[PDB]
Amino acid sequence: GITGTWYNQLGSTFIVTAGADGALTGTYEAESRYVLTGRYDSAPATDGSGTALGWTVAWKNNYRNAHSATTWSGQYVGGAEARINTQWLLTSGTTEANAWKSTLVGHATFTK
């Protein structure tokens, strides 16, 4: 039940298809729509533990380019009240002299 539409508190949403390959494809949301791609464990444990996954978005589309990219690392918790809990990293292009301020960290919980 990863496949579907997910919403986050700050009002971002995304649409993903989970393939049998372990591939993740979709969009993160026209001028605000970006391509997403990632991977998940297509054979998780059945001991109650969640399903590890991660995905990337580059913040460039045919309308805008913020010269940066975000990655989300987390797990999927299934059932009726399904959730994806993540932590993310956002890196912007910078000079070497200013690389030390190039990466933000944060967290986000998604609901279906």
Least distance in Å: CB of 72 to its own copies?
7
**Applying CB under 8 A, which residues contact its own copies?**
10, 21-24, 35-45, 47-60, 65, 67-75, 77, 85, 87-96, 99-107
Q: In Å, how far from its chain's centre is CA 61?
A: 17
- The SS3 of residue 37 is strand
- The SS3 of residue 97 is helix
Question: Nearest-CA neighbor of 14 among 1, 26, 31?
Answer: 26
Least distance in Å: CB of 110 to its own copies?
14
72 labeled binding residue:
yes
Least distance in Å: CB of 9 to its own copies?
9
63 labeled binding residue:
no
Residue with tokens 């990293």: 89
Residue list, annotated binding site for biotin:
28, 34, 72, 88, 100
